[PDB]
Amino acid sequence: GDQRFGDLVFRQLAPNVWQHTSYLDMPGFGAVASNGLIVRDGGRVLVVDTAWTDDQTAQILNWIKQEINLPVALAVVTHAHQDKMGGMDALHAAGIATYANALSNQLAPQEGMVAAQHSLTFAANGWVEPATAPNFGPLKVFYPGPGHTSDNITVGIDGTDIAFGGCLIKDSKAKSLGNLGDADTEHYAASARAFGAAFPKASMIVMSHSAPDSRAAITHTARMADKLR
Ligand SMILES: O=C(O)[C@H]1CCCN1C(=O)C(CS)CS
Ligand SMILES: [Zn+2]
Ligand SMILES: [Zn+2]
């Protein structure tokens, strides 16, 4: 279930995988949830996405210390928006190595974010260049093309049924495709489909602004994105 830890929520998704959830008032929209992931890889922990704020992100690290009690080797953030990179300083204060798409690091200052320390680059087929993602263990990082943003990246967790679409994917029951302020409306549908094709066996799709869902999240998101063109 949903473990409440201060103002955050944690949910175990698999033996070594948890979802972190944090909330921010978006004046005119209410308190918006954002999800990321925590993965135990043997004797270390890997984080996908910060919380919205430094204070919330320090609480993620607090929860990890209580519930896992192993060092956080690295974090990867999935685009330069506040829900994914707003807590970078908390990671850096904690001594955690940080990674983002090169383009996310380029965009970070203008988006009001602190850049990650390290930049990922991607091959033509979308897979991360392995030299740029050293020691990523089971995290398989894929750039699906521009969609939710120009820099959005996605992450599969090897050894599990899980793939993380970040803010690119909404759930199968979503009424509409939101969070589109920086979206690439022409390429969105293809990028959503490319995410699905990159992780063809993943049966649990995790995303920033919906609870985990089946692969119908991907098909439904892509279908709605077809209407943006
Ligand atoms: O408000 C929007 O449309 C876009 C563009 C600016 C940030 N954004 C978001 O939705 C937030 C979550 S509220 C980050 S994914
Ligand atoms: Zn975003
Ligand atoms: Zn988001």
UniProtKB/Swiss-Prot annotation:
Name the residues that bind substrate.
170, 179
The GO molecular function terms of this record are: beta-lactamase activity; zinc ion binding
Gene Ontology cellular-component annotations: periplasmic space
Which positions bind Zn(2+) 2? 83, 167, 209
Keywords of the record: Antibiotic resistance, Hydrolase, Metal-binding, Periplasm, Plasmid, Signal, Zinc
According to its UniProt record, the EC number is: 3.5.2.6
Record GO biological process = antibiotic catabolic process; response to antibiotic
Asked whether the keyword Transcription regulation is assigned, the reply is no
Protein localization:
Periplasm
Q: Decide whether keyword Zinc is in the record.
A: yes
Q: Which reaction does it catalyse?
A: a beta-lactam + H2O = a substituted beta-amino acid
> Which cofactors are required for activity?
Zn(2+)
The entry's free-text remark on the cofactor is: Binds 2 Zn(2+) ions per subunit.
Activity: how regulated = Inhibits by captopril, thiorphan, dimercaprol and tiopronin. This enzyme is not susceptible to inactivation by the beta-lactamase-blocking agents clavulanic acid.
Q: Which residues bind Zn(2+) 1?
A: 79, 81, 148
Q: How does it assemble?
A: Monomer.
Cited function: Confers resistance to the different beta-lactams antibiotics (penicillin, cephalosporin and carbapenem) via the hydrolysis of the beta-lactam ring. Does not confer resistance to the polymixin colistin or the fluoroquinolone ciprofloxacin.
Instruction: Share any extra remarks.
Output: Enterobacteriaceae carrying this gene (identified by PCR) have been isolated in Sweden, India, Pakistan, Bangladesh, England, Scotland, Northern Ireland, Australia and the USA. The organisms they were identified in were K.pneumoniae, Enterobacter cloacae, E.coli, Proteus spp, Citrobacter freundii, Morganella morganii, Providencia spp and Klebsille oxytoca. In India most isolates were from community-acquired infections rather than hospital-acquired infections, indicating the gene is widespread in the environment.
Its family? Belongs to the metallo-beta-lactamase superfamily. Class-B beta-lactamase family.
Q: What protein am I looking at?
A: Metallo-beta-lactamase type 2
Per the UniProt entry, what species is this protein from, by scientific name? Klebsiella pneumoniae
Q: What is the lineage of its organism?
A: Bacteria, Pseudomonadati, Pseudomonadota, Gammaproteobacteria, Enterobacterales
Q: Which gene encodes it?
A: blaNDM-1
Show which stretch of the intact protein is covered: 42 to 270 of 270
